[PDB]
Design a protein around this ligand. Sequence first.
Ligand SMILES: [Cl-]
Ligand SMILES: [Cl-]
Ligand SMILES: [Cl-]
Ligand SMILES: [Cl-]
Ligand SMILES: [Mn+2]
Ligand SMILES: [Mn+2]
Ligand SMILES: [Mn+2]
Ligand SMILES: [Mn+2]
Ligand SMILES: [Mn+2]
Ligand SMILES: [Mn+2]
Ligand SMILES: [Mn+2]
Ligand SMILES: [Mn+2]
Lengths: 85, 78, 98, 96, 93, 92, 108, 105
Amino acid sequence: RHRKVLRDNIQGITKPAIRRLARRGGVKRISGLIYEETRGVLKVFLENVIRDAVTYTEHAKRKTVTAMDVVYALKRQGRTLYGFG
Amino acid sequence: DNIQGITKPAIRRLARRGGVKRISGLIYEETRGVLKVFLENVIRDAVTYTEHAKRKTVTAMDVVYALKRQGRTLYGFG
Amino acid sequence: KPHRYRPGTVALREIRRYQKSTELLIRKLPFQRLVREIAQDFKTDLRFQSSAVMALQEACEAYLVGLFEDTNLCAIHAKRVTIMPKDIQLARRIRGER
Amino acid sequence: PHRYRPGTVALREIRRYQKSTELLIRKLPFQRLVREIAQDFKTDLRFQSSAVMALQEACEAYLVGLFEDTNLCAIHAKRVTIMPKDIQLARRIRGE
Amino acid sequence: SRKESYSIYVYKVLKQVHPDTGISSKAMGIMNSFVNDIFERIAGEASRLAHYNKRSTITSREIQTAVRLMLPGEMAKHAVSEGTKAVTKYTSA
Amino acid sequence: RKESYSIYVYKVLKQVHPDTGISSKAMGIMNSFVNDIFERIAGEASRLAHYNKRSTITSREIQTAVRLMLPGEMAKHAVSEGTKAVTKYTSA
Amino acid sequence: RAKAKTRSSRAGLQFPVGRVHRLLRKGNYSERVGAGAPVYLAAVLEYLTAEILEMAGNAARDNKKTRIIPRHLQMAIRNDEELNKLLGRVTIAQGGVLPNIQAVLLPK
Amino acid sequence: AKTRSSRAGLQFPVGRVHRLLRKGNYSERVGAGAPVYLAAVLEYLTAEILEMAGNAARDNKKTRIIPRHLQMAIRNDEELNKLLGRVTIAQGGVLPNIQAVLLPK
DNA sequence: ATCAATATCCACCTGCAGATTCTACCAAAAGTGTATTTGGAAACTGCTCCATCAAAAGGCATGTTCAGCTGAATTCAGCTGAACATGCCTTTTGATGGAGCAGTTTCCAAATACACTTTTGGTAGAATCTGCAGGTGGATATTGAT
DNA sequence: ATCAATATCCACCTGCAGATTCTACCAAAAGTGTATTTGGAAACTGCTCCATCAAAAGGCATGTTCAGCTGAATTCAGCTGAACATGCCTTTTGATGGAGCAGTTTCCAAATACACTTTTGGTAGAATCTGCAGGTGGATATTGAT
Ligand SMILES: [Cl-]
Ligand SMILES: [Cl-]
Ligand SMILES: [Cl-]
Ligand SMILES: [Cl-]
Ligand SMILES: [Mn+2]
Ligand SMILES: [Mn+2]
Ligand SMILES: [Mn+2]
Ligand SMILES: [Mn+2]
Ligand SMILES: [Mn+2]
Ligand SMILES: [Mn+2]
Ligand SMILES: [Mn+2]
Ligand SMILES: [Mn+2]
């Protein structure tokens, strides 16, 4: 068995989810172009974090990304995350 | 009264180097406040380093270490 | 006349609601797929601890919420109540993300 | 008598000071300010001159960067004049 | 397999401070992360302090200076009080 | 006796610009730069070895640290130069 | 031999002095560790933990709850100036945010 | 007698880098290849910055690189500017840059 | 727009002070040769988690309609901030003289490291204990039409 | 000003998933004795700093004049929020099978340890020659009539 190939999943970050995120951030009104911009920003952020996490995984000679790989990658960007040690 | 030694023309030159074309009259006092906070923080840490080394003379390296602790690495004074 | 709230009232209710709670706001399985697609483009046949995907989602949502806070301040600074891409761009520029 | 129009000399000054690198605050006032502030943390301190020079380089670089961000904030609001609220927005976004 | 954590010490301090309060596992995880983070901040600054002054040994003095460098104003004083007290009690015992 | 990277910076300068000099302040800038990058790479290598319960820092930790600390293309070039130097040293 | 006494109890501490000493020894911080350094560090870690638990438990009681959850820790940190400064770049999983609506967005 | 720097074909000092690794409280042990690799990386970065700064100095009709040339070299290169994003260069100015909306008519 | 008047900036120059480069001596650091130890890789397993799929109900995404309120565009006056002349006060530059602090070396008590042995606190997993989610129902505050 | 509609706020309740307590083993901390390192006090030196005085230029403070920018007021097309039908895709719980992570043993390449030799990098003064005042001339840009 194998996963069918993953494609175009940045669109899973839906307009309602982006709206909810903005709401938690105190935003009352959203221009129509915000959603694509947010998707681009999120994709860059997630790419950077995952690249560093996978670098940690490959240095450990592992094939499984761990929570600690992600934590080290986030600290790596000056974003200490609590709760996954 | 030494923060007033930071004169309006000097603050204006600083703003010019930052690309500012037009400056409201309230900027200068605001800048002074900001500058004071900045200096306080840096100097505090620097003196702590000086005090840890049992010295009474603040060195360039004390200032460099204090600036690094605050995420503002300074080149040229090692 | 069927009842209608005025534009902005439900948005404020939603602000209060989501600022009161802490649950993740992106659907979990789509985010999982996004994580695995991106990671697959760096190294093939990777596996993930479930807590690793959850750590990624917590970090991403916290980042985006903070970014939206700064974006909102940028929009209000320009005498608007509507966030626009240039607000996000100014917030990221000042933050040092560019 | 010859007069440049408002903004022409300001732009000339921008070009001039962005071309050069010398410190823009007078040295003696900055020295005095540094020693005054330091006295409030620990008494009877001495300073290496290079320590004061490092402090001044750091302070001026900080202020120049802050003024850049302040300028972007002012332009964002469709103004060309920086105001205290621009500095406040820039420092808030910066995390200060 | 033996995984160590600060959980039992966090819980003792919690019962000390709020005798009738508990803590969820996720909140305990945040607490463990917090303790390890602060440990690394203090220990790393103490290491750098000893290195700058060419000392082979990290002593309570390096720890104290690191605490003063890490903590905001008043918390620093409080922490210094508790650390100094602990060291003097330990030395007399 | 105070050490610095001055003579090595100057040798590399002569390699790259045989007729160019450097002011004292710029040499200070370069010394700060070299020490900064040294600390960045060495600290990340230390953390890498510690995370994986290893006592030794090897060229593998240095390489991974370079991939972590340096931006994209610079990282590739630095890795090329490091591996190149290591193989040359091993054959010598 | 004499009766075994833990360093934590000698120091009057809840946090473990021996474990902190070992972690200092094995963290490649210095060649040598002084006898007082792990005592001091364990005391400081215990004190900071006590402060955060005090404020988080108060927040939990205000919400009429027995058990501290991450939301209460987030409340305790973000409502305290010095704790919020110390943990400025820290993300608390499942903490959310403080209620805050910019005045200009309220209805007129 | 041949130095390890020369065995590696390097100008930067392999022996000094090895000693600084040993003495920096980084790890209990340092392998033989690590100081070679690290010194090579440092030499490469130094060579890039000196290349660009020397170009700036030649364009300014000057024999000697000064901090201003280093600032120009760093800030005009995307990846160097990213690497040194939070670094202040003493007596390094800023890039000439005037926001378009401030230019006359 | 052109055309004159006016101001500023840039490239060049020379003389020469000062900064950098060159040179030679030497204490300290790197290299060498040899001996010895050891961390960690390789091989071998044994479980732990992960990948992927399956089912089913319901929560949520999507597209659509329609209208309110916002962003965008425009105008314009008053008040602020720029530009500039004038005069003076602070900063800069330079010179002198000491006290005081940063370093340095050394020697012994005191402190810390480390092997071996004993003791117990910390942990994993089981057994027990429970608060709070997740329902209901009613009171109350807010919102918007009229 | 009311009054309907709707959301939100509180109080109640119980069962079970999640948290806490219990239990026994053992890895790790503590105790002991010995070996090794170090911190600091006691003098002593020699640079750096600080204090002090003095003149002068150069930058700053001040006042005046006005251009032009900011903030206010206004208007309007259309974008975005609110509400709803529709339908699907996420969520939750579990099964299957194996990939891969983790524990264990064995041994070698690679690391450390140590005595001694060779080389180097730092330093201060001499020798070199770049960069900076302070001038010019020409390029370039600004400003005001027209
Ligand atoms: Cl936009
Ligand atoms: Cl303002
Ligand atoms: Cl100690
Ligand atoms: Cl190696
Ligand atoms: Mn792909
Ligand atoms: Mn072994
Ligand atoms: Mn409007
Ligand atoms: Mn027991
Ligand atoms: Mn409930
Ligand atoms: Mn297998
Ligand atoms: Mn030599
Ligand atoms: Mn000139």
